């Protein structure tokens with residue numbers, strides 16, 4: 001009830017970044033967040049594989065036992081750092097304060113406004129990038145169904161907001177590039193959603209090594225089996241079907257939507273794809289960071 005007035009409102013702004021309206025008040029809780037050096041941060045631009053990687057990290061920390069991961073929804077097992085629902089739930093930061101190490105922290109903040117404490121404590125960051133076209137489709141449908149978001153209107157107007165960085169958490173170009181560069185000064189494992197669709201066990205292995213964990217071949221196969229898109233769409237612990245429909249309208253668009261690489265071809269018009277590609281080449285000039293739009 002109290003949170004209703006924050007739902008479906010236009011973006012606020014925190015440190016020059018568009019922010020979910022409900023998340024923006026009381027932002028000192030984020031700026032002053034107290035990290036621990038053993039914290040694992042799962043950082044992504046929205047709709048780039050946060051839930052996927054979070055479940056993989058949790059599974060690795062439980063020794064590859066999928067039963068352990070069903071003790072709670074992924075939204076509670078891996079709290080989102082900046083999440084808040086004023087008057088309805090405790091913030092993500094308050095939940096994380098009461099969580100035993102090793103904490104898994106999910107966040108969508110760009111690198112330059114991720115809380116300083118994370119950088120000073122050298123916390124291991126697992127970043128996931130996804131090609132901007134699939135992200136924009138996924139983010140558009142997410143906004144149609146997630147009532148925390150300002151309504152996206154039509155797809156063509158949303159896409160224009162997306163390319164301009166006028167969506168929640170700002171420019172995708174600055175986001176993916178910010179963490180790609182910050183790895184020169186911080187332990188960052190930079191993953192690619194498309195690499196995970198192509199070869200999931202290979203990417204789980206890289207996450208396990210980064211976390212200093214050793215997996216038997218059985219544990220690895222068990223983690224690959226339960227972190228398929230099909231395993232996670234039907235798992236109530238990962239598919240967000242436990243979120244009340246008042247906050248996430250699962251009928252409009254399910255959270256576990258398509259889970260593929262290349263869905264952008266079913267939504268980008270011929271003209272949209274031409275304009276997006278020129279702007280993308282302009283905006284992604286001068287970086288060695290490369291994304292794949294098909295595999």
Ligand SMILES: Nc1ncnc2c1ncn2[C@@H]1O[C@H](COP(=O)(O)O)[C@@H](OP(=O)(O)O)[C@H]1O
Nearest residue numbers: 047048049050051052138227228229257258259
């Ligand atoms: N195990 C998995 N395999 C593939 N895609 C997955 C996945 N788990 C989630 N996804 C996809 O990742 C996106 C959500 O990313 P995030 O967790 O950061 O919000 C959605 O993309 P789609 O909307 O294209 O289906 C969702 O379907």
